[PDB]
Amino acid sequence: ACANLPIVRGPCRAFIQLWAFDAVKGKCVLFPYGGCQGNGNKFYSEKECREYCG
């Protein structure tokens, strides 16, 4: 479900820390979202990300 999405920071210049699936490593990780134009691979909690991904 999440194996085909990269982690995208985007061009904005905030630091909104979020969760995303890292496809190489196989798990949910913390990443620094710039606040805009992400993809669907970002979640507010580890829990939310693990559920959406499996």
Partner: protein, 224 residues
Amino acid sequence: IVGGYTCEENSLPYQVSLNSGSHFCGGSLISEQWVVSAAHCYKTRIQVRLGEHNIKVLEGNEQFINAAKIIRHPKYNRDTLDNDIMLIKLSSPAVINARVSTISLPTAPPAAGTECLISGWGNTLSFGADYPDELKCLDAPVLTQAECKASYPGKITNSMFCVGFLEGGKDSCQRDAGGPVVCNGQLQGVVSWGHGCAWKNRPGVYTKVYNYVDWIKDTIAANS
């Protein structure tokens, strides 16, 4: 901020840090109870920190004040970034003094060439990450609409202008969003976006504060 210098302590008393536990954006104090920042810095809960210089060290003169209202521009567009501006109302008024004071809103858009002052606690590298403890500053000109559009074909809306150096090496950066671009005593811009930071031909893009002057007035009037 990439390629700038550490500000003199408390010489930009309008600069604030927004904090949700750690610092994550900038802002500008525009009256005793209101701060301007970027819409994309939105979070549900935010603490405004005023009189900061070194955000990691308690220096004794900071004011820590929770946001009571956090109001994104009602036309902020997540797809194009049009109208990337936000207002925050403090839960109690800032105490104005030598270290904490307001920056005036602007009376005209700024002219191309005008030297401006951009500041905050964002990253200082174009490649890699080095987040500073002390406020950084940078002197940079406003660019023409033509250079700005040529740099970002198709993406520069009416709410946006560019400020920097086309040769690269100097720009705002992640964790600066929301912070001020001050030109001749006035708040002319808000740190918004770019491709990378300080890359050649990719100047910073900033929200035009002049265009929101009536919206700011109205929103202050309507939430008093």
